Ligand binder design. Sequence first.
Ligand SMILES: Nc1ncnc2c1ncn2[C@@H]1O[C@H](COP(=O)(O)OP(=O)(O)OP(=O)(O)O)[C@@H](O)[C@H]1O
Ligand SMILES: [Ca+2]
Ligand SMILES: [Ca+2]
Ligand SMILES: [Cl-]
Lengths: 370, 139
Amino acid sequence: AALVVDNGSGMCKAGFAGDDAPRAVFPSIVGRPRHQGVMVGMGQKDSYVGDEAQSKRGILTLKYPIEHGIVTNWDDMEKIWHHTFYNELRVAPEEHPVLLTEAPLNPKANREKMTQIMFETFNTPAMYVAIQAVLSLYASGRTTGIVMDSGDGVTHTVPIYEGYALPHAILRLDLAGRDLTDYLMKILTERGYSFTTTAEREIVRDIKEKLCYVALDFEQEMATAASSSSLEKSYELPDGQVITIGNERFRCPEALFQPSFLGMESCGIHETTFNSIMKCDVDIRKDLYANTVLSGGTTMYPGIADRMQKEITALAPSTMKIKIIAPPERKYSVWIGGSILASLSTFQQMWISKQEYDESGPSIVHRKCF
Amino acid sequence: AGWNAYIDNLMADGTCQDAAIVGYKDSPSVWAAVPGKTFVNITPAEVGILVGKDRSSFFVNGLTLGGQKCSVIRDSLLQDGEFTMDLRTKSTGGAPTFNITVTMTAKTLVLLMGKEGVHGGMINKKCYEMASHLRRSQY
Ligand SMILES: Nc1ncnc2c1ncn2[C@@H]1O[C@H](COP(=O)(O)OP(=O)(O)OP(=O)(O)O)[C@@H](O)[C@H]1O
Ligand SMILES: [Ca+2]
Ligand SMILES: [Ca+2]
Ligand SMILES: [Cl-]
């Protein structure tokens, strides 16, 4: 009975393979005990994880062991996984095969360490590591195409051939949902309100998620916002202030396409996507164009699909045919795709065996998982 | 018989449909390969592209093995401790495609092509373990 464990920077999603949805989603945080003397305080333990670490925020030093998708502290991670198997799924990991996910371009040493911990520490009977984006592609039921994945810290463009990611043609953009949240913050402050603090960031994050959208034509929507209140929306604060958002609604995600809104010199997500395609094999450009799939929080903006559609059309050879696919469930793609893969009989044939480990050791990951 | 022992060995478990040892130095020639298949036809030109200093044009252009059109997935053929290139064939219209690993030894390329549905990581590990044996014996 296989386990699926998708490790985001912010939320760990764990479940059983074949299930429609993770049977556990919890923040990816480790708390250690904070100055307070052993017993009185409350935390006698030297380690605390996830939601109970959240609820106990005071008297704890809270850490995120994952950063931009890449593991940052192997001591913490180990406790996330420890807590995932034991407190969250209530399972004995020595009894289950597990699929792990990893960021595109996860460095060699990290892949190896992930492998060592699973086997020497949790005594996994078998494991596999899959590129998050690849799983999102199966969740959409394709095997060829390019995934544009955007979460809170980083955006990636990952073209995929028959389920094989193509690492030479993967591009990383240091521009995701946070930069958007921070930008919205900034332009709401400029307008008259005053979001600057940590508590207020969360309010704004929520406004972003609730009222922002990508505009089909940026100039045109500006002119429509300038001449009409037709686009303005009102919003109900944690106190009782009700506020008005206009321009801001679509000026904020617009930075995904024009990163100079943020003082960045990068190209935007449309052009970063085309640049990936152009780096692939002439013979599959056709199928990537017509299989461009979006995933991650920052792709939930209404109109992002149509706009990607439009911007790729202009950059691409003119009689090519473009198709953006934006799964209504594209927030949860990665764990779903995982559940699809790890539930097949087939999976037995991909994974790394515990004995294979005993034989070849951690570097087996570079041979088997790609 | 000789090098044929290696082929026969690669082929015994039923997971693969083609295999080959190819001498890449000096005058490149096939040392052993499955008869009537693909790798048996590999040209020295093809071999030069697999090992030539251009590690990047074959990304956009693709490459052929025995005139079979292939797509490169990962290239670490020239990298110490890795030694592999992973490819997948390209076919027309729903016709199956197959994963291939080429591993470099001191004198040879070991090529291996999985049957339909066989996973690239298994072909990778098989091909690479065979190459090691050869490399341990100065080949
Ligand atoms: N409906 C939505 N519209 C816009 N942005 C959203 C939406 N839902 C979530 N997000 C953004 O996605 C980000 C966090 O979600 P996600 O789980 O994809 O990232 P993570 O996995 O926590 O972190 P990372 O991707 O950096 O590893 C935040 O920026 C959040 O505001
Ligand atoms: Ca997360
Ligand atoms: Ca403030
Ligand atoms: Cl080897």
